[PDB]
Design an enzyme around this catalytic site. Structure first.
Site, PDB file in Angstrom:
ATOM      1  N   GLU B  26       0.854  -1.182   0.000  1.00  0.00           N
ATOM      2  CA  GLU B  26       0.000   0.000   0.000  1.00  0.00           C
ATOM      3  C   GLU B  26       0.893   1.235   0.000  1.00  0.00           C
ATOM      4  OE1 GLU B  26      -2.957   1.955   3.085  1.00  0.00           O
ATOM      5  OE2 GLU B  26      -3.703  -0.031   2.521  1.00  0.00           O
ATOM      6  N   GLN B  31      -2.132   1.590  -4.504  1.00  0.00           N
ATOM      7  CA  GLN B  31      -1.892   0.289  -3.898  1.00  0.00           C
ATOM      8  C   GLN B  31      -1.692  -0.743  -4.997  1.00  0.00           C
ATOM      9  OE1 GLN B  31      -5.169  -1.417  -1.760  1.00  0.00           O
ATOM     10  NE2 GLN B  31      -6.727  -0.642  -3.179  1.00  0.00           N
ATOM     11  N   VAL B  32      -0.896  -1.763  -4.687  1.00  0.00           N
ATOM     12  CA  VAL B  32      -0.620  -2.867  -5.597  1.00  0.00           C
ATOM     13  C   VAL B  32      -1.190  -4.140  -4.989  1.00  0.00           C
ATOM     14  CG1 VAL B  32       1.134  -4.073  -6.943  1.00  0.00           C
ATOM     15  CG2 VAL B  32       1.497  -1.686  -6.273  1.00  0.00           C
ATOM     16  N   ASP B 155      15.371   7.269  -9.274  1.00  0.00           N
ATOM     17  CA  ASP B 155      15.384   6.496  -8.035  1.00  0.00           C
ATOM     18  C   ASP B 155      15.877   5.078  -8.301  1.00  0.00           C
ATOM     19  OD1 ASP B 155      13.373   6.972  -5.144  1.00  0.00           O
ATOM     20  OD2 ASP B 155      14.829   5.360  -5.441  1.00  0.00           O
ATOM     21  N   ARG B 159      16.231  -1.720  -4.218  1.00  0.00           N
ATOM     22  CA  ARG B 159      14.838  -1.863  -3.813  1.00  0.00           C
ATOM     23  C   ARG B 159      13.872  -1.664  -4.974  1.00  0.00           C
ATOM     24  NH1 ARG B 159      16.811   2.853  -1.927  1.00  0.00           N
ATOM     25  NH2 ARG B 159      15.886   4.762  -2.801  1.00  0.00           N
ATOM     26  N   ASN B 160      14.278  -0.937  -6.016  1.00  0.00           N
ATOM     27  CA  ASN B 160      13.445  -0.714  -7.189  1.00  0.00           C
ATOM     28  C   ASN B 160      13.768  -1.681  -8.324  1.00  0.00           C
ATOM     29  OD1 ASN B 160      11.808   1.400  -6.188  1.00  0.00           O
ATOM     30  ND2 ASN B 160      13.443   2.892  -6.566  1.00  0.00           N
ATOM     31  N   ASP B 173       9.006   0.973 -11.279  1.00  0.00           N
ATOM     32  CA  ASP B 173       8.714   2.365 -10.926  1.00  0.00           C
ATOM     33  C   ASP B 173       9.525   3.346 -11.771  1.00  0.00           C
ATOM     34  OD1 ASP B 173       6.994   1.269  -9.117  1.00  0.00           O
ATOM     35  OD2 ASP B 173       8.099   1.883  -7.323  1.00  0.00           O
TER      36      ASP B 173
HETATM   37  N1  LIG Z   1       5.309  -5.862 -10.272  1.00  0.00           N
HETATM   38  C1  LIG Z   1       5.467  -6.317  -8.901  1.00  0.00           C
HETATM   39  N2  LIG Z   1       5.689  -7.615  -8.648  1.00  0.00           N
HETATM   40  C2  LIG Z   1       5.841  -8.071  -7.381  1.00  0.00           C
HETATM   41  N3  LIG Z   1       5.769  -7.206  -6.329  1.00  0.00           N
HETATM   42  C3  LIG Z   1       5.546  -5.881  -6.531  1.00  0.00           C
HETATM   43  C4  LIG Z   1       5.388  -5.401  -7.846  1.00  0.00           C
HETATM   44  N4  LIG Z   1       5.184  -4.089  -7.764  1.00  0.00           N
HETATM   45  C5  LIG Z   1       5.205  -3.715  -6.487  1.00  0.00           C
HETATM   46  N5  LIG Z   1       5.423  -4.779  -5.708  1.00  0.00           N
HETATM   47  C6  LIG Z   1       5.511  -4.785  -4.316  1.00  0.00           C
HETATM   48  O1  LIG Z   1       4.446  -3.920  -3.746  1.00  0.00           O
HETATM   49  C7  LIG Z   1       5.169  -2.944  -2.908  1.00  0.00           C
HETATM   50  C8  LIG Z   1       5.083  -1.605  -3.517  1.00  0.00           C
HETATM   51  O2  LIG Z   1       5.860  -0.705  -2.764  1.00  0.00           O
HETATM   52  P1  LIG Z   1       5.137   0.440  -1.891  1.00  0.00           P
HETATM   53  O3  LIG Z   1       4.326   1.349  -2.798  1.00  0.00           O
HETATM   54  O4  LIG Z   1       4.217  -0.214  -0.893  1.00  0.00           O
HETATM   55  O5  LIG Z   1       6.233   1.280  -1.109  1.00  0.00           O
HETATM   56  P2  LIG Z   1       6.978   2.512  -1.787  1.00  0.00           P
HETATM   57  O6  LIG Z   1       6.049   3.769  -1.724  1.00  0.00           O
HETATM   58  O7  LIG Z   1       8.251   2.800  -1.043  1.00  0.00           O
HETATM   59  C9  LIG Z   1       7.368   2.139  -3.552  1.00  0.00           C
HETATM   60  P3  LIG Z   1       8.744   3.226  -4.119  1.00  0.00           P
HETATM   61  O8  LIG Z   1       9.960   3.083  -3.138  1.00  0.00           O
HETATM   62  O9  LIG Z   1       9.189   2.808  -5.559  1.00  0.00           O
HETATM   63  O10 LIG Z   1       8.281   4.652  -4.135  1.00  0.00           O
HETATM   64  C10 LIG Z   1       6.551  -3.381  -2.802  1.00  0.00           C
HETATM   65  O11 LIG Z   1       6.775  -4.055  -1.565  1.00  0.00           O
HETATM   66  C11 LIG Z   1       6.795  -4.269  -3.888  1.00  0.00           C
HETATM   67  O12 LIG Z   1       7.653  -5.343  -3.458  1.00  0.00           O
END
Ligand SMILES: Nc1ncnc2c1ncn2[C@@H]1O[C@H](COP(=O)(O)OP(=O)(O)CP(=O)(O)O)[C@@H](O)[C@H]1O
Ligand SMILES: Nc1ncnc2c1ncn2[C@@H]1O[C@H](COP(=O)(O)OP(=O)(O)CP(=O)(O)O)[C@@H](O)[C@H]1O
Lengths: 291, 294
Positions: B26, B31-32, B155, B159-160, B173
């Site tokens: 989230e 949200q994913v 970014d 983690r990305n 992302d």
């Molecule tokens: N295509 C995908 N396949 C598997 N898991 C995914 C995915 N896309 C996103 N996720 C997972 O859903 C979550 C999305 O990240 P989240 O939005 O909750 O934090 P965040 O705001 O820090 C993303 P960011 O750091 O890129 O801005 C992550 O934990 C990621 O592992």
């Protein structure tokens, strides 16, 4: 503004509180000394000096959530003699006040530096060992409640009027969501000179890394507030620790006490002693020591 | 107050073929969620596919919708590549907006590496040295495609980068309002909330991100790979990082990292952005290391 819902177990009427001299301010907010009447339900008229944690005028929505997070954390962790305990909260009819136990003699680091050998008397060796034993017992209880301090140091240990050690700032919130994203706040930095090597490398905190920090705290006690790793630049500390560098034995420190420091500073976190074991070893040293 | 979107039949998937499942994360403005889609596989159509669905939260504003639509349209414009999180389809008609992207079962690269370190005095996979080079080679090819498609990431970090079931590195992302390469550069705003440890010094001062600033970030990502998910600049507080970088500080060579890979890592951290290697050069450098491992 926004008022938090009242918890009848901890709610104290703010009309029973008289704010006094400030004790300090930081990035969290400000701590104010105060007198609370009725904080003891057995003696509803006994005034008790408490410390009030509140937000400053330049407080955002995150600062409020961090203060509420610390208050709710202290409720779940429970009470122990060797920690700063929660005493009450004012959530209705005004800004949020978090009432904790008051330590008249300040933090441990300033408590030691103000009592170094040449009108605040002077500490003996058994006094310094007792100080470490009380901190170890406090960390033993926190670890039993699955609480990781992440910032154990002499500055975060408070001393009461009765010379009782109380660990503070244990229920603080961490960068949980955006841990690798920072905003131009104020100052304070990372306590890298108290952090275990694996904590410096991965930014992951465990009970084992708190044990390492307790070793550094032990080094502060018997140096009477000395600064760790003097002259070592911050960008070379991890490499030196990884290669085996450890701080030397402080002047006038027994072999047993320095061994406890070195045990806390083992390279492998699984080989370090537990806080339960540290309490036992400090207790044995305390029995054979006499002044 | 209608919230209808234009029709794009080449990317449209019937929401009757998509079953939403367990949440995956989230965010702040969205949200994913994990989901199962049927009849979408390009090879065996009868085989259902597990996908990730980007959708709006229950309190999303009309600007949150425009951001999600823009990210979907950006994934259309950039195109498909094996080493990125690709767009698979979208549900835009007769219901809430569902943006279907590829699902990576093994999480992000940082946790992928940390969970595969040698035992530390206390039973999964074991990454060899050539596996780490192959990991860096795949991330470089993904950034080479994004750079060729005018996309800056801003970014880039472990983690990305997401890892699929087939151990394929996929950059995620990349379409979050990030696309400046047509001609003139582009600045940003003030405030904070930004990954200092991965940003180039010129991106930290004037707050302008380029393809050269992403190369600096890739250098930091290289350090994460060969430390098996270490946090950059160990022992250096964030407040003191920018001053040390100006004075010439660079991270030491990771343990059990070859000299050549450290040289590739170090030229990514060139103070002058003009002297940093391009992603096309980084792919050729890593491919040379990849072929000389016998
Ligand atoms: N295509 C995908 N396949 C598997 N898991 C995914 C995915 N896309 C996103 N996720 C997972 O859903 C979550 C999305 O990240 P989240 O939005 O909750 O934090 P965040 O705001 O820090 C993303 P960011 O750091 O890129 O801005 C992550 O934990 C990621 O592992
Ligand atoms: N519960 C308490 N009882 C008595 N004194 C307290 C107290 N809490 C804090 N203090 C005093 O207020 C001072 C500041 O504490 P604080 O938690 O704000 O540190 P800080 O976060 O502002 C960083 P620094 O201590 O380096 O200035 C401490 O030195 C301490 O002596």
């Amino acid at each position: 503004e926004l008022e938090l819902p009242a918890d009848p177990k901890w709610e104290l009427s703010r009309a029973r509180l008289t704010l006094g001299k400030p004790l300090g301010e930081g990035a969290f907010g400000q701590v104010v000394m105060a007198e609370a009447i009725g904080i003891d339900k057995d003696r509803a008229a006994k005034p008790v000096t408490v410390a009030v944690k509140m937000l400053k005028d330049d407080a955002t929505d995150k600062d409020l959530s961090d203060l509420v997070s610390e208050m709710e954390m202290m409720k779940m962790i429970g009470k122990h003699k060797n920690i700063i305990n929660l005493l009450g909260a004012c959530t209705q009819g005004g800004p949020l006040y978090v009432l904790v136990e008051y330590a008249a003699k300040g933090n441990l680091r300033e408590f030691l530096r103000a009592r170094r050998p040449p009108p605040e008397e002077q500490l003996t060796f058994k006094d310094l060992v007792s100080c470490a034993y009380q901190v170890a017992r406090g960390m033993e209880y926190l670890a039993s409640q699955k609480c990781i301090h992440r910032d154990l140091a002499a500055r975060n240990v408070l001393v009461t009027e009765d010379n009782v050690m109380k660990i503070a700032d244990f229920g603080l919130a961490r960068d949980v969501h955006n841990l690798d994203y920072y905003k131009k706040t104020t100052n304070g930095r990372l306590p890298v000179k108290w952090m275990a090597p694996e904590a410096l490398f991965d930014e992951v905190y465990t009970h084992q890394s708190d044990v390492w920090s307790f070793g550094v705290l032990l080094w502060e006690i018997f140096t009477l507030g000395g600064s760790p790793y003097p002259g070592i630049p911050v960008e070379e500390l991890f490499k030196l620790l990884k290669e085996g560098h450890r701080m030397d034995k402080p002047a006038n420190c027994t072999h047993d006490l320095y061994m406890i420091m070195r045990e806390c500073w083992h390279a492998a976190p699984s080989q370090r002693p537990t806080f339960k074991q540290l309490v036992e070893d400090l207790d044995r040293v305390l029995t054979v020591t006499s002044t």
